[PDB]
Amino acid sequence: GLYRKYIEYPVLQKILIGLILGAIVGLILGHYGYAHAVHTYVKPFGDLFVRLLKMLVMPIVFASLVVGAASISPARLGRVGVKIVVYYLLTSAFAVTLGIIMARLFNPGAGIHLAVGGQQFQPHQAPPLVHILLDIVPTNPFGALANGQVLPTIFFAIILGIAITYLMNSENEKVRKSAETLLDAINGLAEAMYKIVNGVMQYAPIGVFALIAHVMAHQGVHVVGELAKVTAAVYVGLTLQILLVYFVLLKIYGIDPISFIKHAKDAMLTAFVTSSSSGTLPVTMRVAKEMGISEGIYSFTLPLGATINMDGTALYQGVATFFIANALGSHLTVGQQLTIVLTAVLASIGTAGVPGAGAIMLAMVLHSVGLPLTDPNVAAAYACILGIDAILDRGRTMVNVTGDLTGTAIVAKTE
């Protein structure tokens, strides 16, 4: 009865209820001097949610990359394909840069200080560039999976899928039969892990409630100030991206901006209430039918840019890195900021596109800068911004969908 009714309730609405309750409980308990009780009674619930998220990282990465690499067997570059790919990367790269400016004009987390364990954060010297590049190739494919190395796993997974499609269409019947069996076994593992992800998200409202309550109880009132600044900074950057970038480009080629906004309102509203680019993809394709765009051209750009042209996610990754860096009390050099731009844009493609996937890929750019998740101080900062992702997930989704439609219009105008 009670357990059943908890199941069919919307997950996005369920998470919002937990976040609101967590903030209210944390402030009340912290004000009465009960911050010690929450650290020993509700914190384990938050830690369990973090541990569950880390388990799904590797089996998804290895299985999905092998299937994806073997899926795209042909290598064809159309005349209109190069036009849309170069636009996608340029917008993604500039979106990160705009987020850096917003992350610098407003300080996300300069005021807050983290002293977990009584030891301040100490940065470590980065390895030489030559050594980093050579570590991509693994000396043991099984060792990389067991030792928790992500970069060697990606390189081996991609080449394994490419090797499969070469012998999948060979002249030997026995070789062909073995190729399908191996691919099907790997494909089944990828599908199974997606089901576990759905079950994990049902526990998210409990996990988010514990994380928010623990943060607010130990330190509150003031912490809301930094959380408001980072939330406003992302939205300010996103609304600037829509107006300063897309509107200017449309005016250059003569597209009427007011007509585009009125015609694309259905796609923008659908993305906000769903927060899934893949889920709102049928809506986006329906809108393009009335635009006068040729059938062939838009049917290739919108599916392609759905998981590759997420401009809002790239801006979110750049801003969130500065908030964590300021929280630890360290500073980012000019060389490190350029590194973030390269890492952030790559993480944009790697994001699956499902709600909450952007926060998962945020750890990737943190390791490149020099902020491993194994550090307890870094883990506390990451887990604190992890809870508030639901508020900042909807805003960047609309920007992701908006960039897809305007890219097709520009390339279609110039054929």
Ligand SMILES: N[C@@H](CC(=O)O)C(=O)O
């Ligand atoms: N909100 C993103 C997904 C994500 O950020 O993980 C999208 O809908 O494209």
Ligand code: NA
């Ligand atoms: Na882009």
Ligand code: NA
């Ligand atoms: Na997109």
Ligand code: NA
């Ligand atoms: Na992506």
